[PDB]
């Protein structure tokens, strides 16, 4: 170790469990409310409607999301698997 010569290390104020809890709470807020919880009280919203709102934000009509919703969901799942697999491979 590096503590035998008087170089004591301060433990962090926030333990890793509490950081994980904060990240999980933020993830739940961003999948169940979108941006309403980040600018006030949390407002419930379905995830496809949040995706359609983001599609309208980037300049695309919302009907193209519902026309191929299964394709977009499969692409998102494949992307999640891809980032997990590439992360597992520093």
């Amino acid at each position: 170790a590096q503590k035998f010569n008087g170089l004591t290390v301060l433990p962090p104020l926030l333990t890793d469990e509490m950081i994980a809890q904060y990240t999980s709470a933020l993830l739940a807020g961003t999948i169940t409310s979108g941006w309403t919880f980040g600018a006030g009280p949390a407002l419930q919203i379905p995830f496809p409607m949040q995706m359609a709102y983001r599609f309208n934000g980037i300049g695309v009509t919302q009907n193209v999301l519902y026309e191929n919703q299964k394709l977009i969901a499969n692409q998102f799942n494949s992307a999640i698997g891809k980032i997990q697999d590439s992360l597992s491979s520093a």
Binding site: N5, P11, Y22, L43
Partner: protein
Amino acid sequence: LTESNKKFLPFQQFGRDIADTTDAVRDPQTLEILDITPCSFGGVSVITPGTNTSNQVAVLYQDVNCNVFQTRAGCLIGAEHVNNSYECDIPIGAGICASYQTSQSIIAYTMSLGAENSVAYSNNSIAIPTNFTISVTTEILPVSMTKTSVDCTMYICGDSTE
């Protein structure tokens, strides 16, 4: 001198570590391996409830192992640990704070990251607001401080030419 679990050569009779410190030595009285660990040391810390609130204080140790509660950030004395959790105001470290709460005495507890509330999620349910409140948020941002000039000739030297 703790009892070690690692054996050595038959002639060396000493030890070292990665930081290049002699932390092991055989005892040639009976060829017994013994570790060397530095003695306990640290600094004391004082938990104060505040001015015009209380008078009693608590004494906190950083990494010294031991009314008296053994925390993960050392040894805490003078504060009674309580299982329930509130929002803390005086940081300590390792996930536990200290506060003055009901007479009334200083207590130590795990912090609460927030109000435990679960939002209702459904595929055909929303929450559209029908009213709003205009709120004002105050933010403080310093842009400068005092400008000072330092000259050696008047500072390091006085009234002597040497």
